[PDB]
Known about the structure:
It is classed as ligase. The protein has 41 residues and is mainly alpha-helical. 68% of the residues lie in helices and 0% in strands.
Amino acid sequence: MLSPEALTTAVDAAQQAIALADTLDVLARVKTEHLGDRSPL
RNA sequence: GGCCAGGUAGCUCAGUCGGUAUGAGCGUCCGCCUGAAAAGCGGAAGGUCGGCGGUUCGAUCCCGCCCCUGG
């Protein structure tokens, strides 16, 4: 699960959803899913 | 003077001498529910753990000065 290849796939969907965040409210949700305490990272 | 105890979520406070503060109660949001609510049940959001530095792959947790609280 640690695999740096699978690790890179996590930062991919993060920055992708971050770049696809159009509003500040969507970002706060995106930050929760990709940077919060329950995020895969 | 030099040593102590404290600073932690919106409020009142626990807790940790390195990888989750599974933080609590209340406060906020969603669902079931109701004409609409609340409780109840179920699901979530939110803290840069007092500031600035030092070490470490990584410090609320280990080192130094200071901000301010009763000692």
